[PDB]
Amino acid sequence: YELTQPASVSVAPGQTAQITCGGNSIGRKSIHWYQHKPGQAPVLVISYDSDRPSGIPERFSGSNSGNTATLTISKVEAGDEADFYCQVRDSDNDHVVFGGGTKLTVLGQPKAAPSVTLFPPSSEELQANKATLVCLISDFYPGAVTVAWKADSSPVKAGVETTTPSKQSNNKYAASSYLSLTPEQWKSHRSYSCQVTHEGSTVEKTVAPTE
Amino acid sequence: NTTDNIDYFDISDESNYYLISQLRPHFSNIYFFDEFKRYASYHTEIKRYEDIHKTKVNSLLNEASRAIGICNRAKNTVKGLINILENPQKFKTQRESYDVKLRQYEEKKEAFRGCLLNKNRKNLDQIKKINNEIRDLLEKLKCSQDCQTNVYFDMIKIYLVDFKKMPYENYDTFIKQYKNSYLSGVDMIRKIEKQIDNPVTINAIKFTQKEMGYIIDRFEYHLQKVKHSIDQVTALSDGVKPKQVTKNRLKEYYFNIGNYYSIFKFGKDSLNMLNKALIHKEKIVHNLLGELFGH
Amino acid sequence: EVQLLESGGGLVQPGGSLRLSCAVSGFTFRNYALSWVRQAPGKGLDWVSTISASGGATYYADSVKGHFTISRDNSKNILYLDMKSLRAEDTAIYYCARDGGSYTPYFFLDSWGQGALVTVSSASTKGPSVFPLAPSSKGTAALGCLVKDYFPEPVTVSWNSGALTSGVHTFPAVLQSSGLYSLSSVVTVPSSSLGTQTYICNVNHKPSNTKVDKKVEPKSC
Question: For chain B, which terminal residue's Cβ has fewer other Cβ atoms within 10 angstroms, N or C?
Answer without folding.
Answer: C
